[PDB]
Structure formats: C-alpha cells, structure tokens
C-alpha cells in the first residue's frame, strides 16, 4: 500500500510540533534530507546517519526510558490523538528490538513499523 | 464473551496448571471477575499457563507478540487496548511477572478482563 500524505496526515501539529527536535538532530547526526525523505515516502534503506537521527529524535522527544532505550508506553502517549490506534496497530509486532547500539535499535523500529503499515508510517 | 474458542483451548492448560500450582478454583475465579487480589499460587497458576501456552521466550518471560497471535482473532483488538501501558512487567521471578501482566490488564479493562 502506498504512503498517505495529505492536509490531514501526517498530523501537522506533530510536524510542526517536531521541526526544532529535527534541526537539533539533523545537526547531530549529519543525516541528509534525501535519505529521511526517502526512508519515510519511499523504499526502505539503510544508511548509517539515518540510523543514528532516528535515535536522536527518541531523545530529544523523551520517549526513552531511564538507559536511553524507547519506551514504547511514553511513545505512544506522546503521539497525536488523531494517532492513537494507527500506531497502536503499526507497532503491536515491533516491540523487542534488536541491535547492538541505540542507533541500530532506532532504525529496528523504524524499519519494522514502515514494513508494518507503509501507508501510515512517515519519518519526521 | 469470552469468547467459546478460547475456554476451550485453555481447558487443558488450565487442568495442567491447576495441578502444578496449587491454585483454588475460588481464587480463579475471584481474580477473573472481583476485585485484584494477591495469592501466591495464583501468580504461579499464571505464569503456568503461559508456559504451557507456549508464549514465552527463551527465559520464560511473556513474549507479548506471541501471546497476542496465540488468542482468538476475535480479541486482537480487545487485547491491544489491555496491553498498550503493560509492556514491561516487573517482578522478582516469572509468577510475580505475570501475575503483573494479569493484574495490569485487569486494571486497564475489567470490563473485558476474565481468567480462565
Ligand atoms: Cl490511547
Ligand atoms: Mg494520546
Ligand atoms: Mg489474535
Ligand atoms: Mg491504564
């Protein structure tokens, strides 16, 4: 199925809502633009600054837990109302990742919830 | 509700587990339909079962993807609400584990919650 994007989603408070935590890790992380933009609307790819982006926004979001590892329970609770259940069903077969670091962990997640529902999975 | 198919996928786990543990029939039931309570065979009832169901990982622990894909279709998405702030149980041995997971379930929907 193909990526939903329009005036209703992604959220655009959440979007906007993450756009300095992005510059913040963007800077961070030496991630380009191409390969966010090509993770969230297009295939799936690994590239190692992406990996390492995608931890820093757990961070910064304070979704993690008290060793830096995602909480998935302060994910969920930090995700948009309009949200609740896409993410719900999006993550329900994602919940132990593996990898040996936070960067690898991060992209478990991300990769997993993009092969999960690739209509609704976006990266900020 | 529950639903037919699950009593009876449970029946010979629980006669398994009943007999392992020790647990009353009363504090199955008590637990199921009354108020959270603590007892000690309960908690090893519980855990029981799981390991019988064969959900649990390489330690013994609930794998959570393979409890969900081991209930009745009809309560996928029943399950995903009970589970969604009871992902990381705590405890100082499998049965104070999962009677955790059961008690974080009973509290976040009694209405639905049953043990068998
Ligand atoms: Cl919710
Ligand atoms: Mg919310
Ligand atoms: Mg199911
Ligand atoms: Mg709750």
């Given at each position: 199925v193909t990526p939903r994007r329009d005036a209703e989603y992604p959220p655009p408070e959440f979007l906007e809502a993450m756009k300095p935590?992005?510059?913040?890790?963007?800077?961070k992380t030496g991630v380009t633009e191409e390969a966010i933009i090509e993770f969230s609307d297009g295939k799936v790819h690994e590239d190692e600054n992406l990996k390492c982006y995608m931890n820093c926004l757990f961070h910064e979001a304070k979704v993690v837990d008290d060793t830096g590892h995602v909480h998935?329970?302060?994910?969920?609770?930090?995700l948009?109302?309009?949200?609740?259940?896409?993410?719900?069903?999006?993550?329900?077969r994602c919940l132990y990742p593996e990898g040996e670091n936070?960067?690898?962990?991060?992209?478990?997640?991300?990769?997993?919830?993009k092969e999960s529902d690739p209509k609704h999975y976006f990266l900020i």
């Open positions: 935590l992005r510059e913040i890790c963007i800077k998935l329970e302060k994910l969920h609770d930090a948009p109302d309009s949200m609740h259940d896409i993410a719900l069903h999006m993550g329900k936070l960067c690898e962990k991060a992209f478990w997640l991300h990769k997993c919830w």
